[PDB]
């Protein structure tokens, strides 16, 4: 069966663009791979949207090579905050994180 011989794959730390309905490709990066077959996650991933530092789940069909689409998707937008992402993806692709839990058993400061 010859049905378009193409099988791409992304990994944590990879710089890609995520397409959303009503919005243009937003500069993003991979933060985690798919579990296996749990919850309502067919083949999505946790991508980080620079500028706003927001995260969401999208499939590979909605993800594209940043460097490759940088010139096409790397341009200011009316949604505001888009440009801010351009600077981050270039100046700091590892900006922001998942978050840490301060004080679990006891606290000292507050």
Curated annotation (Swiss-Prot):
- Similarity comment text for this entry: Belongs to the HDGF family.
For bias kind Polar residues, which ranges apply?
91-106
**Sequence positions that bind heparin:** 19, 21, 72, 75, 79-80
- In UniProt terms, what function does this protein have? Acts as a transcriptional repressor. Has mitogenic activity for fibroblasts. Heparin-binding protein.
Record's comment describing the protein's domains = The PWWP domain harbors the heparin-binding sites and is responsible for DNA-binding, while the C-terminal region is essentially unstructured. The N-terminal region does not contain a typical signal sequence but is required for secretion. It also determines exosomal location.
Q: Which residues carry this modification: N6-acetyllysine?
A: 44
Protein name per its UniProtKB record = Hepatoma-derived growth factor
Post-translationally, this protein is described as follows, namely: Sumoylated with SUMO1. Sumoylation prevents binding to chromatin.
Cross-link position per record: Glycyl lysine isopeptide (Lys-Gly) (interchain with G-Cter in SUMO2): 80
User: Partners and quaternary state?
Assistant: Monomer, and domain-swapped homodimer. Interacts with nuclear proteins NCL and YBX1/YB1.
Where does cross-link Glycyl lysine isopeptide (Lys-Gly) (interchain with G-Cter in SUMO) occur? 80
Which locations, inside or outside the cell, does it occupy? Nucleus; Cytoplasm; Secreted, Extracellular exosome
Query: Which residues of the parent chain are present?
Result: 1 to 110 of 237
Q: Which residues form the PWWP domain?
A: 12-69
**Positions of disulphide bridges:** 12-108
Which parts of the sequence form the motif Nuclear localization signal?
A: 75-80
């Amino acid at each position: 069966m010859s049905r378009s011989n193409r099988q791409k794959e992304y990994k944590c730390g990879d710089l890609v663009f995520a397409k959303m309905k009503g919005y243009p490709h937003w500069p993003a990066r991979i933060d985690e791979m798919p579990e296996a077959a749990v919850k309502s996650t067919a083949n999505k991933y946790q991508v980080f949207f620079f500028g706003t530092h927001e995260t969401a789940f999208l499939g590979p069909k909605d993800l594209f090579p940043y460097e490759e689409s940088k010139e096409k998707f790397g341009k200011p937008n009316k949604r505001k905050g888009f440009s801010e992402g351009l600077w981050e993806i270039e100046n700091n692709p590892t900006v922001k994180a998942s978050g840490y839990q301060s004080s679990q058993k006891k606290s000292c400061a507050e």
